Automatic annotation (TrEMBL), chain A:
GO biological-process terms attached to the record: double-strand break repair via homologous recombination; double-strand break repair via nonhomologous end joining; protein K63-linked deubiquitination; proteolysis; regulation of proteasomal protein catabolic process
Boundaries of every MPN domain copy: 10-145
Domain of life: Eukaryota
The keyword Zinc is assigned to this record: yes
PROSITE patterns listed in its UniProt record: MPN (PS50249)
PANTHER family hit by this protein: EUKARYOTIC TRANSLATION INITIATION FACTOR 3 -RELATED
Name by which UniProt lists this protein: Proteasome (Prosome, macropain) 26S subunit, non-ATPase, 14
Keyword Lyase set for record: no
Pfam families linked: JAB, RPN11_C
Cellular component annotations (GO), alphabetically ordered: proteasome regulatory particle, lid subcomplex
Signal peptide: none
GO MF, one example: proteasome binding
TrEMBL record, chain D:
Family assignment from sequence similarity: Belongs to the AAA ATPase family.
Residues of the full protein shown: 52 to 252 of 403
Localization terms from the record: Cytoplasm; Nucleus
Species: Rattus norvegicus
Protein name: 26S proteasome regulatory subunit 10B
From TrEMBL, chain E:
Transit peptide keyword on record: no
First-listed, main subcellular location of the protein, grouped into a coarse class: cytoplasm
UniProt keyword list: ATP-binding, Cytoplasm, Nucleotide-binding, Nucleus, Proteasome
Location of this fragment in the whole protein: 149 to 369 of 442
Annotated protein name in UniProt: 26S proteasome regulatory subunit 6A
Organism: Rattus norvegicus
Record's subcellular location: Cytoplasm; Nucleus
Protein family per UniProt: Belongs to the AAA ATPase family.
GO cellular component: cytoplasm; nucleus; proteasome complex
MF annotations from Gene Ontology: ATP binding; ATP hydrolysis activity
Recorded coiled-coil stretches: none
Subunit structure: Component of the 19S proteasome regulatory particle complex. The 26S proteasome consists of a 20S core particle (CP) and two 19S regulatory subunits (RP). The regulatory particle is made of a lid composed of 9 subunits, a base containing 6 ATPases including PSMC3 and few additional components. Interacts with PAAF1.
Residues in AAA+ ATPase domain copies: 74-213
Length: 289, 70, 51, 201, 221
């Protein structure tokens, strides 16, 4: 039904997204929530700088889950940091459900909407997720009628939108009633990207390291012994394998548990292992003395 | 429904029993004490090869047993 | 997917969404064959009886 | 006070209808294999918070219906019926009303009463107390009055069980009750278990 | 507490309230709301029999305080046996009027039923309810249906009937009262019946009903 609204594109920072994953994994299976800190810039963009949590409770994703004590306490301290940030919205996780909000959860979204109408609820799924691209959706949440009329696409303009299905027709219907998937963009760059890249500086010691010679021998022995077992099937394999049909081949020439795949796999581990150990021993010798 | 479950359970068991021969495993060992409250289908061979007989003990056999319990 | 699913006395796959027929399964069984199979009856040649 | 009660209700509704299971066998710390008391066998997880150590196959766990992760630990499985049998121990009838039977009464004590206090007496002999008691007699004698009558006077844990309606046509449901009473007694040791009218069985 | 009935919602699960006891339909249908009395007059003659029956059932229900003073255990059940047509059904209706209590109609054939192991639960429920209804007299017709235990039956022998025969003893035994439930039993013969049932602390009085005397038939007319 006619109203002149705009959609909120949710710009999630790298720092913020990672914390949202952290909280959601931890909460399992019980659904947990928290508030989002950010800034309101332009005429629709709410950006999430950082996220903190409201307590883990089995009364989670509720108005109750929200703690007045946490919120005040943080905000005095935040004034000192030289970042007192706006509450752009609230994030929650469902690891008992998908991107379909619960019945309590719709009321809770509404309370946030009263405070700042630039408020969204972002659903974080880590074991009700079907995608490793981070299954997150955004809702502002508006009534059923708006979908039915077809008003709701007039309001969203300046959106692309998207649709995914973690869990069947029931979720799709829940999504459509709300506000469906409004676009999530990321504020990221190369400095943040380099931090995430890392593993070990300890690679420094490890590249040079090689083990005791008795150990070099253990490895070589174990592999040659192994290779003998598979060898007897291999004879048959090369003689035949006219079949190209995976199910028939499997029974016929022991195609499943194949001697080719495994024997190759074995020559390749043995070769590489011997090279790095041998190569290091020699390199160290020359250099230290 | 009751009678049918027990019947299904036993068919599955026969089918899985036959599965053993391909592998090293030794088959089911079971005791029939009353054979008339048992199916003769379950006493048929081809899955049985060895059949154990126990009879009643005689005098001498019995005496030995009596010492162990006492 | 499959017009052979309309053919009677064929074991058939179904995909649920109303119990809709998918395709006919190429592996079929009857109880008469299954009777032979479970027993594993001893089978023997002419020699055993022989003499 | 009313708000506190109202709060737990929401916990069920968030999980959507919580279900009981048991840990069949532990695959790894994260993944357990659970056989359900409701039906299907399941592969399950555990909350970060909920410890692995607590769960046992001797005991029951609870699972979130919609994601199949173990929320928490639940106590050892005991049937509803067996709770009623333990309670049924005072059914009245004092030791006076069962007299004259007194010679036969002395025989019942040797078997039942003596191993409770000390199994040590039979141990010195070098024999394990004799298994099972059978009470039989012509009608009206008071074979059931006797078993029942001593159980009340001592007031020891005594399961009094009617076994002439415990068999049902419900396959698998008849089995559980019969098992449960033996297991239970081993736990609530010392105990006596009396089944009346097991002529039926 | 375990065994008590409780409601749960099948769609999403909460215990709405706790639900009180429940007695199956199969027993419920057989029951009666008490039918008019024929009294002792309509069953003309049969004087000696009436005197025994009245003494056993009716006087302990009404003047129950005096019976406690005598010290006695009020009957577990009394038995009527002997040839049909002697007005047992009529006599039952009369018993009911004197006591001012419920005669709970029970058929011996209804207790053994088509469902198996459930039939045994039926006997437990029928006596169980009589206690709850107030003090009661259970009018059982044709107890010959419930079973005759001489069993050794190496082949079958039914045994829906066995379970019910044993359960019926249990309810008569003083695990539950038998001073609250009285049994007025009518069976055509005691020859058919087994001694497990008859005893003297399952059925206390044995009242034989001979066929009417000469004066008795004039009273009936």
């Amino acid at each position: 039904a006619p109203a002149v609204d705009t959609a909120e594109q949710v710009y999630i920072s790298s720092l913020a997204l990672l914390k949202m994953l952290k909280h959601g994994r931890a909460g399992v299976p019980m659904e947990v929530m928290g508030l989002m800190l950010g800034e309101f810039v332009d005429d629709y963009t709410v950006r999430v700088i950082d996220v903190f949590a409201m307590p883990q409770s089995g009364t989670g994703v509720s108005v109750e889950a929200v703690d007045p004590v946490f919120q005040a306490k943080m905000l005095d301290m935040l004034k000192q940091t030289g970042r007192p940030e706006m509450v752009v919205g609230w994030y929650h996780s469902h690891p008992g459900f998908g991107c379909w909000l619960s019945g309590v959860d719709i009321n809770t979204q509404q309370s946030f909407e009263a405070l700042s109408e630039r408020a969204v609820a972002v659903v974080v799924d880590p074991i009700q997720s079907v995608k490793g691209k981070v299954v997150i959706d955004a809702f502002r949440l508006i009534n059923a009628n708006m979908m039915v009329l077809g008003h709701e696409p007039r309001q969203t303009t300046s959106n692309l939108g998207h649709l995914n299905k973690p869990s069947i027709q029931a979720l799709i219907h829940g999504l459509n009633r709300h506000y469906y998937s409004i676009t999530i963009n990321y504020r990221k760059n190369e400095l943040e990207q380099k931090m995430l890249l890392n593993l070990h500086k300890k690679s420094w010691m490890e590249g040079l390291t090689l083990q005791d010679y008795s150990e070099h021998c253990k490895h070589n022995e174990s592999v040659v012994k192994e290779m003998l077992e598979l060898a007897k099937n291999y004879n048959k394999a090369v003689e035949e394998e006219d079949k190209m049909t995976p199910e028939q081949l499997a029974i016929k020439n022991v195609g499943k548990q194949d001697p080719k795949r495994h024997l190759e796999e074995h020559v390749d581990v043995l070769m590489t292992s011997n090279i790095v150990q041998c190569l290091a021993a020699m390199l160290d010798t020359v250099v230290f003395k | 429904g009751a009678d049918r479950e027990v019947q299904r359970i036993l068919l599955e068991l026969l089918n899985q029993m036959d599965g053993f021969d391909q592998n090293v495993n030794v088959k089911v060992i079971m005791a029939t004490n009353r054979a008339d409250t048992l199916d003769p289908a379950l006493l048929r061979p081809g899955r049985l090869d060895r059949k154990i007989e126990f009879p009643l003990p005689d005098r001498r056999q019995k005496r030995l047993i009596f010492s162990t319990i006492t | 997917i499959d017009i052979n699913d309309v053919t009677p006395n064929c074991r058939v796959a179904l995909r649920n969404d109303s119990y809709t027929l998918h395709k006919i399964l190429p592996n079929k069984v009857d109880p008469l064959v299954s009777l032979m199979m479970v027993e594993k009856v001893p089978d023997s040649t002419y020699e055993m009886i022989g003499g | 006070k009313q708000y506190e009660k109202s709060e737990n209700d929401l916990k069920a509704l968030q999980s959507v209808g919580q279900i009981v299971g048991e840990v069949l066998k532990q695959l790894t710390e994260e993944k357990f294999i659970v056989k359900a008391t409701n039906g299907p066998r399941y592969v399950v997880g555990c909350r970060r918070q909920l410890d692995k150590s607590k769960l046992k196959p001797g005991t029951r766990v609870a699972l979130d219906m919609t994601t199949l992760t173990i929320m928490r630990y639940l106590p050892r499985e005991v049937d509803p019926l067996v709770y009623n049998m333990s309670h049924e121990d005072p059914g009245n009838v004092s030791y006076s009303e069962i007299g004259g039977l007194s010679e036969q009464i002395r025989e019942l004590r040797e078997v039942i009463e003596l191993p409770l206090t000390n199994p040590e007496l039979f141990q010195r002999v070098g024999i394990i107390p004799p298994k099972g008691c059978l009470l039989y007699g012509p009608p009206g004698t008071g074979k059931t009055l006797l078993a029942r009558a001593v159980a009340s006077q001592l007031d020891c844990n005594f399961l009094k069980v009617v076994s002439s309606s415990i068999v049902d046509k419900y396959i698998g449901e008849s089995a559980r009750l019969i098992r449960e009473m033996f297991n239970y007694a081993r736990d609530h040791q010392p105990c006596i278990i009396f089944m009346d009218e097991i002529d039926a069985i | 507490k375990p065994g008590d009935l409780v409601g749960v919602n099948k769609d999403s699960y909460l215990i709405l309230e706790t639900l009180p006891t429940e007695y199956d339909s199969r027993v419920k249908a057989m029951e009666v709301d008490e039918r008019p009395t024929e009294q002792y007059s309509d069953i003309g003659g049969l004087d000696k029999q009436i005197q025994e029956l009245v003494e056993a059932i009716v006087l302990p229900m009404n003047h129950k305080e005096k019976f406690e003073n005598l010290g006695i255990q009020p009957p577990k059940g009394v038995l009527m046996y002997g040839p049909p047509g002697t007005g047992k059904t009529l006599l039952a209706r009369a018993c009911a009027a004197q006591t001012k209590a419920t005669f709970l109609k029970l058929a011996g054939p209804q207790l053994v039923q088509m469902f198996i192991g459930d039939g045994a639960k039926l006997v437990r429920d029928a006596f169980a309810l009589a206690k709850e209804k107030a003090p009661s007299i259970i009018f059982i017709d044709e107890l010959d249906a419930i079973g005759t235990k001489r069993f050794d039956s190496e082949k079958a022998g039914d045994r829906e009937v066995q379970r019910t025969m044993l359960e019926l003893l249990n309810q008569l035994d003083g695990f539950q009262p038998n001073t609250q439930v009285k049994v007025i039993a009518a069976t055509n013969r005691v020859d058919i019946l087994d001694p497990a049932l008859l005893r003297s602390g399952r059925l206390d009085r044995k009242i034989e009903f001979p066929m009417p005397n000469e004066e008795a038939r004039a009273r009936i007319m």
